[PDB]
Symmetry: D2
Subunit: 68 residues, 4 copies
């Protein structure tokens, strides 16, 4: 009773990408297979990386979504 078979969709934060031409991003909390916060993203060239949710980095993303 806990999780069994652990597997986070994106390992570590994929901040290597910069926020700007992004398009949409998903944000999933820490499930069983993923006890760490797991948020993924999507760019203009329909591809997907992933970022964190405990810093001002993704806050610039959501803030960039509010500006419009």
């Amino acid at each position: 009773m806990s999780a069994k078979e652990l597997r986070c969709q994106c390992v570590k934060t994929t901040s290597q990408v910069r926020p700007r031409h992004i398009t949409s991003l998903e944000v999933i909390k820490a499930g069983p297979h993923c006890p760490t916060a797991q948020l993924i993203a999507t760019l203009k060239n329909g591809r997907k990386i992933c970022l964190d949710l405990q810093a001002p980095l993704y806050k610039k993303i959501i803030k960039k979504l509010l500006e419009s």
Copy 2:
């Protein structure tokens, strides 16, 4: 300024659902077919509705995700 009536994955805000047992939600900005901010979500029972991003309602969601 913007457009209207095209192909928004979710018409109007689906706030009829309350934030609590949710699981994850996507955040899409106003594209072409969707000049309105288009945010969709996902529940614990893998289903999906959609919320807004210009009020304190979704702020309770992201805030509920920061809690953990």
Copy 3:
């Protein structure tokens, strides 16, 4: 006794788009709010339309994914 307009993320089939530069597509069955088969898609320009799952149209999509 369960079949009527509820909340399908995509009403009617969005076949107006042609399969070619697509990137990825979701395949959801007919849930409660969606008694109709609900398949959504994504293009190379991170956007999303939707197609059917009972014709040779989406079979050209999956077949296009098998070719590679």
Copy 4:
């Protein structure tokens, strides 16, 4: 086919899960960061694993989606 050291979303096929109470699954082809076919999925308990697209395993999924 593969450049050098890329970033796939789901490593290896997550067939450890059996198809039955599933809810919906994504189908992404081999991008740049993912030269391998990258198909992800979703269960009834809004979670996400991933399967392959070159065997009869996912054919039981799509076939399970056609039956209804």
